[PDB]
Symmetry: D2
Subunit: 282 residues, 4 copies
């Protein structure tokens, strides 16, 4: 099952697309629906015609419906350095200490209102000359840490603020339009091997590909199960929480995002998340 959400006349509607391309309108809140699917693979709803899923992915708005975040995730967290100048402890840089350490990096990323979806604009802080989109795979957790599904997440980060001081990391991570995900949430059974997925980032600037990298999730060293273990340790999380797993694609200092740029991220079996950029004014 792949789960998406639109806004129609000011209220939300959740739809599910099945492998046979039949679309179902959910009777339930989508978080509770993912929890139900997790138990018995059942979607409560009715089969609907006239929902143009493909046009929503390509055009965002069709008829009176516009695609958005697939859910409101009460909390969003992130893990850093899960894949293969700055501060440092005893010569060893703090980032490469984490890469070897038993304890991984876990940080708070967003609340639902700080997030955006397919077609909606991510944001660059007003006080940032070097903001980068971090293309990552993310998971939707229940309160026990069980994976309910996967989605594409964009951990937008003001890399210059982090670089100045690791104590600025929250400021570099947590702000309006600092997080994007979708276009859908795929249920767990849609992904057989999470550690064999391609992730392609593209940054379009004036109809022209300013950057393009990609990496497979087989390059991931820190396992997702372990990231969750540390997240929920003495730390109750609400159902529908999202954990973003980390990025490998990191454009250079000179590849900072700017107003009007289009960030396109593609992950295998999930889809392609497209978002414009909005530079904030002081």
């Amino acid at each position: 099952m792949k789960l998406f959400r639109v806004v129609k006349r000011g209220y939300y509607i959740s739809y599910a697309i099945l492998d046979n391309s039949t679309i179902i309108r959910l009777d339930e809140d989508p978080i509770k629906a993912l929890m139900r699917y997790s138990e018995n693979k059942e979607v409560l709803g009715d089969r609907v015609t006239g929902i143009d899923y493909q046009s929503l992915l390509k055009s965002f708005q069709i008829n009176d419906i516009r695609i958005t975040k697939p859910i409101d995730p009460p909390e969003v967290w992130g893990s850093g350095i899960s894949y293969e100048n700055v501060a440092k402890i005893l010569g060893k840089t703090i980032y490469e200490k984490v890469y070897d350490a038993v304890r991984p990096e876990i940080f708070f990323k967003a609340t639902p209102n700080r997030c955006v979806g397919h077609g909606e604009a991510i944001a660059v802080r007003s006080d940032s000359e070097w903001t980068l989109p971090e293309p990552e795979l993310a998971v939707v957790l229940d309160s026990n840490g069980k994976i309910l599904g996967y989605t594409i997440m964009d951990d937008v980060s003001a890399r210059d603020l982090e670089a100045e001081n690791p104590l600025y990391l929250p400021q570099s991570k947590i702000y309006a339009g600092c997080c994007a995900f979708g276009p859908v949430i795929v249920t767990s059974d849609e992904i057989k091997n999470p550690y064999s997925l391609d992730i392609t980032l593209k940054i379009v600037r004036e109809g022209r590909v300013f950057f393009e990298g990609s990496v497979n999730t087989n390059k991931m060293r820190r396992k997702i199960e372990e990231q969750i273990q540390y997240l929920i340790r003495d730390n109750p999380i609400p159902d529908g929480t999202i954990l973003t797993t980390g990025t490998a694609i990191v454009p250079g200092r000179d590849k900072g995002l700017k107003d009007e740029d289009i960030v396109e991220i593609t992950i295998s079996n999930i889809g392609t998340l497209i978002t414009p950029v909005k530079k904030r004014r002081k």
Copy 2:
């Protein structure tokens, strides 16, 4: 107006105690009341008798009511290094860089469910051998950054985890029972000079005063308005958001909290917050 809340048989009731020992029971949600009082110093409610506010401060529970968090703050943030081995950037340590730098340390600290109050227990993480209570003055804010009131907050920190790597700061700060505040929220008018208050931390182990030490808020070199300025830059905060301003009282390596302790924090014009300590186990 000094504002507190109780829990009675599964529901909350908010009371505002006024300059004169006359207690008023609120018609409104307590966060909204603070916004109204900030506007015109009006309070909606009936003058109540038979509410032993002083017995609640000492005993926590009287009859069928018990004191708790005065409000549910949708968000809690913190600001470190506001008053006068570890990592470093070009020799100079990360902490003493933030002190000198124009930008302060702002970090996400808590959500309502992770917060506790007078009489309720704060938590030491299962995997922390050195966790300290950081006594601080905290401000309740509206979404514009207007100081709706002051309170005593305990920013409970797993200092060992912080010391290992600054990137473990979120994990050291954000967990169940990592944050306590109360026993009241005082309105802006109750405090003439916020930089003229006596913060005192006491820790009681087995009836004996295991630690003591106080400081005045005149020693605070980072001004709260600056902290609020950076907190909200490009960062929409909800009404009732709490910003804890930083600590000056820092016990040593041998003075780490453990099960059954009693952490008492006093601030001038606000009162004394008392929370027993609870150790989490693996």
Copy 3:
């Protein structure tokens, strides 16, 4: 548009079958949707498939969905003695009367018609759900009637079939027992759908048919056309709403003409089918109440 409603896992879903047999699932409260449609003929919702409406009519239930009252009408009122009936010259020596003329035939000629309160939503049942005979009635009859769904201004939002189940023996004993005879658990039934106003060009040209079935055998049958109605619906509404504000989705049942005999009283296990032209067939089993 014809409006129906199902229950599914303890919650309601409303559906609107359009004229080209396309089924739409309402995003709105059905009463809200009736009012919308009344203004501009629009229905908010997605076209759906797999909703086997014709099966819900015949079988009542399919998998986890079951048909019920098409709406919760906040109030239900009725208007008796609205059809043509000849001055039958020997009034039963027992009906209440005023200066010799029976109360029922005084209403017949009066300017003021009979208007009475019939039910709340929780006293109403739908297609496939059981109507009741009171535990203390030995002559309860179904009264097949055309009913209209009203807004607060008295505007007709649509029509449906209504069964005004009446403990006629209690009404016979004393007209002051009328409320006890009309108002009780399962005393009222409507559906299977609410058809919008435009689905009925002439409301005074519909065939109403009643069938009572006992153990497969057809116990009673009769019919009547609404061209026989004398007390017109516009008048019934005028008197209903006079100094008496009604909520949106109120239903006014407009009276019956099919009256089974004294020997044809309802009893347990019976089935009651009512058919009206352009609306459908309402079917309800009967339940006798135990003391």
Copy 4:
């Protein structure tokens, strides 16, 4: 306990005044509170001061609080002829048939929105030339028929219509402002004998007593418990349903209500209900 309700700034607040003058503000819905009191006589709430109950009875609106119906009864039913030209069955009149018969008159009277309270206007229908107030005792019921308390009720009746035809009875009983009750609901224990109570009806036209009359509830022949039995027979009623038990006081043909009149009704241990009279236009 004696239970009343005000409207303050658009919302409702219910208060309980105990015999010893002490006024309690309720935590629960008043209907639920009455069911709790019926159980074990426990009342959840706080004692309050500054609520002048006696002045509210006399002034209706004090400052920004205004007394109204003590509860919203989901249903109101009536019962005629419980005490000592027209239609008739076998020469004998329909009313005295009911008086003797084992089955009493039970009829539906009002929905909550058709009811009014102390200080609010009852109505005379536009098409009625002889409307009389019927002062009656009334009981508040739970769904099992158990009496939760007593109150004054005015069954405002368009008598000319009832006279023309008893099939017009519902039109004479059910319309906007056809019912009034309060100012309080007294709990069951506040009345030791309901069959020994003085009911008094004053009507005030242009300064003067236009009608006065009274009668005790010892003249009531139809017992209340019987009326409740027939009400709930095969006929479930919601919690908070009111049953009014018929009137003994009946003014004559000349004493029909009209615009600007005032209706006072008094019953021992309950209080006095006052309502202006509005005549509807065409």
